[PDB]
Amino acid sequence: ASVHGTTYELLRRQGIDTVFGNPGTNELPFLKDFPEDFRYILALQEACVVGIADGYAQASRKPAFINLHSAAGTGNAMGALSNAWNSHSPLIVTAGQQTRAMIGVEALLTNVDAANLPRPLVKWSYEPASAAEVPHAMSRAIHMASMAPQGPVYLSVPYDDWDKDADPQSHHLFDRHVSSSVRLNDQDLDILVKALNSASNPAIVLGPDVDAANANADCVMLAERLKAPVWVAPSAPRCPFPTRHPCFRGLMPAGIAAISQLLEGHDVVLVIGAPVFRYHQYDPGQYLKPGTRLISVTCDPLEAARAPMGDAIVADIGAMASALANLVEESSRQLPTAAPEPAKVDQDAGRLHPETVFDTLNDMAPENAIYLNESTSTTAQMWQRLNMRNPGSYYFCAAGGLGFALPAAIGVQLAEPERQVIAVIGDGSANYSISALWTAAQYNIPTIFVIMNNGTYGALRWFAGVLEAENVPGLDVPGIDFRALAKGYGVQALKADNLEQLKGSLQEALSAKGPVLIEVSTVSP
């Protein structure tokens, strides 16, 4: 068999059937004779390719396979890889290299130093030393991406390798099963359970890794048994809990002092599937107040090492959440009371307040909608106003890297054909990966894109307001016509200048058979 044939067999035997890519000449020998059981999803730029794959992987809870062109293609994607790293997204990034005979002279399209290019944003990066090694290296890539803590990996392949004879012994790779589904040993797990059972006022903090593991339901049970309030860890890339559950307390402020104040009086704080902590703004203070101790369960040694406080357990989030939910006692304490609904903000017949947009979305969207957020100045409001009862209902750039939500919303919609995806993206953010729209059009992936247009990089104007920073250039982005951009890429486009039109546009979008972009005129900050 050829390296080509063996590699495709390894992929399908490992459950991979889709290639997200933007092609080049180094990749032609790989893409030729494309398997009929495989599907190729083209995007027009590599940040879009990787973003779509990322959304697909996160929503599907399985690895996504990517094929990019050499150094330039890989480099175009490395902003996307920065989010993928922070979101533990299992992405297998392959890139084509020049033929071995021409790597030395550095012919055009040679990926020099290839493995070093994507670092430090990958778990594993490699170029095989011979054609026969390619399937083995692909096996390594598949497993490195998939093992806890999941993450992106990189494989560079000289284009002449594909047609070479494969090693007959490569068949041993095909059905390899590797498991990291592990939990704390019985003795120490009992100690933990006893500590939660004995807590007088426990609190729970959940991260994105909870949603990735589909441990949401177990976390509800654990919270119910412990009669404990549940917060989402700061800078949240996913939603790990029903936002309308009586225990839910919302998104934590991304500040050291703010979080210690919030947790004050809680004697034991159990953090599950989240970094400790993902702070953002500088909020000097105590990491924890006297009387509060912290216990973190994380799938990622790097997270456990860098936590500035608390004990930590490195294990699988699914296995740990299941175990805890089932072991802990049913506390006699009174179940926490549900947070009151958000107030309705005054709204005139003009520009729309972000709050109004989210209320309307909540009123009109299906109960199993999936939201993506890249409207950076309205995150707090979005979390307060959208009722997300099911898992996999929220996605936000884990590294704060813009250009995520637009493509990722397309990958999410591809992974969940029966759940309406609605991406809420600011006018600034929309541009980073605008060409992603074309993929939704071409494959008729019916994502709804809600563009929040206030003409400025609002979150930056705000941060600059706090720093009392004057004379900062480059904060306004006037003069963009998002309906024209959507038309340019074949996506149906609507405009909403007021509530009447917002309701009308949403009704039309929700009834449409393909992707739709709605440009919303929001108030200026």
The secondary structure element, H or E, covering residue 100 is helix 100-103
| Residues contacting 19, CB < 8 A, separation 6+ | 31, 38, 39, 40, 41, 65, 66, 67
What amino acid occupies position 208? P
Question: Interior CA angle at 177 toward 173 and 180, to 5°?
Answer: 135
Which of 1, 31, 42, 72 touches ligand TZD by CB under 6 A?
A: 72
Q: Look at residues 189, 200, 163 and name the one whose alpha carbon lies nearest to residue 319.
A: 189
**Structural Rg of the chain based on CA atoms:** 24
CA 509 to chain centre: 24
Site string for Ca ion, 441-470 (x = CB under 5 A): -------------x---x------------
**From 8-16, 113-121, 333-341, 364-372, span contacting its own copies (CB under 8 A):** 113-121
Residues at the site binding Mg ion, with contacts judged by CB under 5 A: 119
Report the residue closest to ligand TZD, judged by CB. Answer: 426
Touching Ca ion, residues 394-433 (CB under 5 A): 426-428
Binding residues for its own copies restricted to 31-50, rule: CB under 8 A: 31-34, 40, 42, 44-47
Q: Which is nearer to Ca ion, 29 or 428 (CB)?
A: 428
Q: By CB under 6 A, what part of segment 408-427 binds ligand TZD?
A: 426-427
Q: Under the criterion CB under 6 A, does residue 79 sit at the interface with ligand TZD?
A: yes
Please count the residues of this chain forming the interface with Ca ion, following the rule CB under 5 A.
5
Q: Which of 352, 409, 412, 363 is nearest to 385 (CA)?
A: 363
> Hey, is 43 helix, strand or coil?
coil
Q: Does 459 bind ligand TZD (CB under 6 A)?
A: yes
Residue pair 257/282 in contact by the 8 Å Cβ criterion? no
**Stretch of residues binding its own copies (CB under 8 A), selected from 8-16, 204-212, 333-341, 482-490:** 482-490
Question: Cα–Cα distance between 3 and 85 in angstroms, integer?
Answer: 29
CA distance 151 to 148: 8
Are 125 and 175 in contact, with CB atoms under 8 Å apart? no
> Among residue numbers 189 through 248, which ones bind its own copies (CB under 8 A)?
234-235
CA 353 to chain centre: 26
* Residue span binding ligand TZD (CB under 6 A) among the ranges 20-28, 140-148, 196-204, 273-281: 20-28
Q: Which stretch binds ligand TZD (CB under 6 A): 5-13, 22-30, 137-145, 483-491?
A: 22-30
Residue 492 Cβ, how far from ligand TZD at the closest point, in Å? 22
> DSSP 3-state helix, strand, coil percentages of the chain (rounded to 5)?
40, 20, 45
Residue 329 interacting entry, from its own copies, Ca ion, Mg ion, none, C-beta within 5 to 8 Å by type: none
Q: Which helix or strand (DSSP H or E) is residue 216 part of?
A: helix 216-226
State the burial class of residue 181 (Cβ atoms within 10 Å of its Cβ: 0-12, 13-18, 19+).
Answer: exposed
Of 145, 39, 52, give the one whose Cα is nearest residue 92: 145
Residue 94 interacts with ligand TZD (CB under 6 A)? no
396 binds, among its own copies, ligand TZD, Ca ion, none (CB under 5 to 8 A by kind): none
Strands 268-272 and 203-206: parallel
Give the nearer residue to ligand TZD in terms of CB position, either 5 or 488.
488
Identify which of residues 124 and 419 has a Cβ nearer to its own copies in the complex.
Answer: 124
Binding-site annotation: residue ranges for Ca(2+): 427, 454, 456
Which listed option, its own copies, ligand TZD, Mg ion, none, makes contact with residue 377 (CB within 5 to 8 Å by class)? ligand TZD
Q: Which amino acid is at 167?
A: D
Does residue 428 belong to the site contacting ligand TZD (CB under 6 A)? yes
Nearer to its own copies, 365 or 404 (CB): 404
Query: Smallest gap, in angstroms, from Cβ of residue 442 to its own copies?
Result: 7
For its own copies, the binding residues in 362-401 under the rule CB under 8 A are: 397, 399-401
Q: Which of 212, 485, 496, 517 binds its own copies (CB under 8 A)?
A: 485
Question: Is position 253 an interface residue for Ca ion (rule: CB under 5 A)?
Answer: no
In the complex, least distance from residue 377 CB atom to ligand TZD, rounded to whole angstroms: 3
Q: Where are the beta strands (DSSP E) in 50-131?
A: 64-69, 91-97, 124-126
Q: Which parts of this chain interact with Ca ion (CB under 5 A)? A: 426-428, 454, 458
Q: Which parts of this chain interact with ligand TZD (CB under 6 A)? A: 22-25, 69, 72-73, 76, 79, 375-378, 400-403, 426-429, 432, 454, 456-460
